Symmetry: D3
Subunit: 255 residues, 6 copies
């Protein structure tokens, strides 16, 4: 429906890419509860849209998201905490984060929840939760550490210091850096490529990669094998291999 | 043995390095079932050869291995796959295995290199997991070892698009530890295998087992296992000789015992 | 007490940083049992000193620590061993390692036990245990691998080869590289920053980041959440978020 | 309102939310519609401040004979690949009062509950194998973890059923009561849980569940963090003071 | 053919692969030669399309009294660090019919089996401690996971034996039968399993085993993936249809 | 020189270190001072070359009624973030002879022990919930792992107690003895253990403990490494030889 905090729209060839834009410039995209609710709606919608194969999440040019909404948490109590934030992780289709500008606190964690992260030349990542007398509460101490290593993760989480796009890429937090002006376009091109592939196979691949963080290498490889065997129960695997053998373009039907 | 797809031979000082070279150039070293069987044979042989301390696995200059053999699985069914189950044997080898990757190391080829303990890349090597382009996903640790070495963002990008990354990219990301000119790559990998072979076999096997454990348990339990293995080295003659040699300011004489 | 192998002292703004300096220059700071005992004492002392918020551990300019003391284990037997080295991991306050020069074997492991590692331009890391007929025995095969990746870790552990500061940073083993002359000063500045934040919250954050190596991503995020909720039971969380909302400097009380 | 389930509050001061599966015709076979209502009832009781614990039960002859086979009969692999365990998202304790058949999906639903009380004639089993499939809702995970590999393999591979007595001896269920008083007894247990601090009860339940998600070392660390957390509540202060002051504790779920 | 074991096809349609340890003089002490033949028999039965389940047993006096001490007596540490668990690579179900002694390596072998049936006079134990060593084939892992820490510690640290009734009560074994009919009963169970779809049975067995290799959360996710997989088979379709059409299922193992 | 505990060496050759909690007035409430002495006694017995196993017990009426409520009553959340399980750092086996009450911290202490023997009238429980808190020393972890989720949830959420018979049936304790002979019997078991090689016993105990810290696969690998290690000891050679030579083994703890 008519969204208050986000702007959605389909893009790329055949409009196969679902674009979600955080639109709360006043608050530098502070992830207030309302914005989160709309974001989850947009994600669910694009997830159920058969023409969409990949989603691109972005914010403004100055800020992807400055964090969660302090104003909204300010008066919460411990007990409140014990009486929605990671719905993006339940989405089966790939989600690419096009990070331009600030991606701090909850904003940084939201980007890390995405499968792939592309950063604009002037993006900035950080977990300033410590400066607010709290710690990251949406995977900031988990996903950051796993991607960047203990030393840098400890430095960022304990001081609240920010790192550049170049630092993030070097550390493995993000895989590409693009000029501010073309960042979103480039992320859409990548989303396109992914959308071109079979949707069912892409979902299986994404699930396999994610498993790398939930089990031992041994069990991860076993799960990957089971999923690999599964692709053989699909038409697109048959079509993909035949196309290869027949040296012709493959025609995937997401089935 | 009389191999059809691979070329083996001992190299390095005292012929301590076992060199296995994938040899199916017309198929750019596509890993067909027959080649896999010979590779495993060569590995087992070098493993049982007491003169060998480390193995170097390589392919051609244009390709380490362009991938599994699609033509061989193109007709398989789900039931075939399940009710039919050896791609991972190289992981059962106790001696270190170094992959000297020159050119293409894609799909199964990339996974094979990642199964190796160390990876050295030639200036023009290329890594990628194009399984997605074939309507399938990596099936030999491609989504596990790549991710663990390269991080989620790059791993997702590669696995989901099938895009390739350069040798420089792979090194920067931690997939490979060294990059050498195409012409000297294999020589350099042999030098490293030699250094490793110089050490005590038994101790080297324990160390390799310890490092591998870093991917199978919590840091806490990993450190405990490492401790047990560390204590174990004290039950060997080489440990004694090694420390004695250092204290006595003289060269160590290891006997792999 | 009056230490024989280490030099301690408080530094940074308001002497909030506890500096421990390994001082056995003749043995290139080889980690003998006596030095380890003093180091543990210094750590415990700084841990219990209310004025200290972070500790900086360093050695000489030529060597952080050349390794454990070989002569001391030279005559030990397997039964000796099976029937203290990592107490530094029991410290709740952050510990930063300012590595200048050699950080080999036990020295490298000690540095890796620290939360953050800063390296001087000429630092060198390596695990030469293999050259002595033994393997790293204080997390060298675990922390190195987890930070540097399997390929480089195997190369280092199996050959005993050393890597440069630049290599270590690129691989994620250390997060910063500074000139030899200012390295310790820079690490103290980082410790200062950490010490200005809430001690209790900092301890929780450090615990959260460390958990990234002890459980699946799913459970790690759950633990992080519980710790996040916990911060709400503190005065500093309330002051931190209030200060932000009221556009004013936060005054933490480590409570 | 509900077509497949019957809900109602019970116990002291109506602190117990009782959900009763009601599709006697199909022996409470868990069809998609019933699952949707069950989840609703659960969410409702979860949000009801008056409720401290939930009791889930079915009929006297069957808790739930299994998922609805006719509903999946024609599904294909792609349909599948493209919530039956929402009960696991509930923070308040859920007790399963199993009378009669608790097979397949029914057995898995009971195992998803925190506590299981079985009527004298209850029967547990995972017959999915007889249908050319395997348990798909934790049947091979929760059963094994509670009963051990030998018995779990026997049940899953043959589809054989085990008695209430077997289930109790194996640790699948913690109590066995006469068919007629089973539900009443489960409600008494839920009452007791409801009398304790909700916030503390939620933390304890989360701690016990963690025993299946991490190593003992990390589990103990998490438990410690939760233990420290209780000190941030009024109920913990009240509970310990009441003890020291030899008086009854008055919890406020805060 | 074989020196230490006796194999033969049993059960309806010869669907059961029976392997019998045959080293009576050494009370089936698991020497290296016997292990090699056992692995051969397993591989053979595994590749035999007519076999759906394997039953492993020994004599009436002893399933297997332990590894062969004589064989390791002279080994050194270095020797040790320079295929005991092959039975674990078999995809088809393996039932252990334990009669008499199942000690040390013998106990571990039985524990490696998916299901364990014990004769009235079976005896389990891990006496490795009495020999100056510890169980080296999962004795401290599988025993503990099945029996609990207290009893496992007692057995491993003292070398004490437990009865068939103790083993069953503790969950080590799921059934106890008279010595004379034990093997027959295990074959009947193997028959039942063999009757079901081989591919689905292999998936189920893999799912149950996963209960010991990952957190409940990941185990449930793996089980789900395998569950979806069954939908890519003809047997699942046949199984569910047969139920719906109230008729007998004809599985074709695919 | 102990105020809260009574120690003394018992059994053949004074091979068993017996520690008796002695604060009958407080039903052995584990106050901080008692914990400090307990740890001292443990460390002492651990360093005593003549001791091979420790037996921990309390009074006939109570092993330990819990941690000291009076001592934590005034603690704050912040205090909590400013050596309760040191018994777990002891390499030699520790047997808990539980007579009477073993509640809360007391129950957790018993569970930290390697083996638990219970007197006919022992009682186990985790009443932390009744005090507005949750078990904080492994009560939700070790209890669950030994007793299963259903019973563990029941105990932790209601604070209800279970009998010795219940505890044994659930696997929490491995033996039940009359109140009067319980400690004697536990000492006999400690004797047996102390009979074997101390170095090998330490390795075995470490192996069994690993069953709760890693996947079955890695646990088996660790066990293997420990198994190989035993071959680097004289006691293993002595043990195997003694068996081969049909003679009694003479262990020298190395
Ligand atoms: C499960 C539940 C979730 C838990 C997850 C983890 C916890 C967190 O995410 S906490 C968030 C951490 N983020 C922060 O501390 C960042 C706060 N913001 C900043 O530091 C600055 O805005 C910064 C550096 C990005 C840019 O500074 P600047 O260019 O001067 O812009 P600035 O004027 O501060 O911001 C503009 C407006 O956005 C608002 N805003 C910015 N960030 C936030 C935020 N995180 N919450 C609420 N409002 C915010 C500002 O208050 C201001 O509004 P106004 O002037 O009307 O009060
Ligand atoms: C349970 C606890 C677990 C144990 C943990 C794991 C095991 C380990 O840590 S073993 C450590 C491995 N490290 C080594 O072998 C490195 C030894 N050091 C070196 O090789 C060199 O000192 C190096 C390369 C750093 C610098 O070279 P260089 O500048 O020429 O110095 P160099 O002349 O070799 O040595 C100078 C002095 O330092 C001493 N020293 C340096 N490292 C050590 C050491 N590890 N042990 C003992 N003495 C040492 C030397 O003995 C020598 O003293 P002296 O002349 O009186 O005999
Ligand atoms: C993530 C997605 C979830 C995945 C989870 C795992 C998979 C599963 O749960 S599959 C379910 C396994 N369950 C079964 O195979 C049990 C099927 N039922 C039975 O065996 C018998 O009903 C039994 C033994 C319980 C009782 O027999 P009986 O007393 O004769 O009663 P019975 O006549 O069979 O049942 C009465 C009615 O209930 C129906 N019914 C019973 N169970 C089911 C069921 N599971 N699905 C659908 N309808 C069922 C019967 O079809 C019959 O209806 P009708 O005669 O109009 O067709
Ligand atoms: C890491 C930090 C550790 C965290 C671990 C987890 C948390 C816990 O352990 S909390 C402990 C939970 N235990 C309890 O709630 C049990 C409390 N006690 C009881 O319920 C009863 O004493 C019971 C049922 C055992 C016996 O009742 P009864 O026979 O009437 O004896 P009772 O009169 O109550 O006890 C005798 C004396 O011992 C004292 N006492 C008993 N238990 C405790 C205790 N846990 N703490 C302090 N004092 C205690 C009583 O206060 C009384 O002393 P006094 O009359 O002078 O004040």
């Amino acid at each position: 429906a008519n969204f208050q905090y986000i702007i959605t729209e389909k893009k790329g060839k055949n409009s196969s890419v679902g674009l979600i834009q955080l639109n709360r410039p006043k608050a530098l995209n502070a992830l207030c509860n309302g914005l989160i609710e709309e974001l989850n709606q947009a994600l669910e919608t694009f997830e159920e849209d058969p023409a969409v194969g990949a989603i691109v999440l972005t914010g403004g040019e100055k800020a992807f998201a400055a964090g969660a909404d302090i104003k909204e948490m300010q008066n919460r109590t411990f007990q409140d905490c014990y009486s929605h934030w990671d719905h993006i992780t339940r989405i089966k289709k790939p989600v690419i984060a096009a990070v331009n500008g600030y991606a701090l606190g909850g904003g940084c964690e939201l980007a890390m929840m995405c499968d792939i992260i592309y950063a604009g030349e002037k993006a900035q990542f950080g977990q300033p939760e410590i400066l607010l007398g709290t710690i990251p509460g949406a995977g900031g101490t988990q996903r950051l550490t796993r991607a960047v290593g203990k030393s840098l993760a400890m430095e960022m989480v304990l001081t609240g210091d920010r790192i550049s796009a170049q630092d993030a890429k070097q550390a493995g937090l993000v895989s590409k850096i693009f000029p501010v002006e073309t960042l979103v376009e480039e992320a859409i091109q990548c989303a396109e490529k992914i959308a071109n592939n079979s949707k069912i196979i892409v979902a299986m691949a994404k699930e396999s990669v994610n498993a790398a963080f939930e089990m031992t290498l041994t069990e991860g490889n076993k799960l990957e094998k089971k999923l690999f065997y599964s692709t053989f129960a699909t038409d697109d695997r048959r079509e993909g291999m035949s196309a290869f053998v027949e040296k012709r373009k493959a025609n995937f039907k997401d089935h």
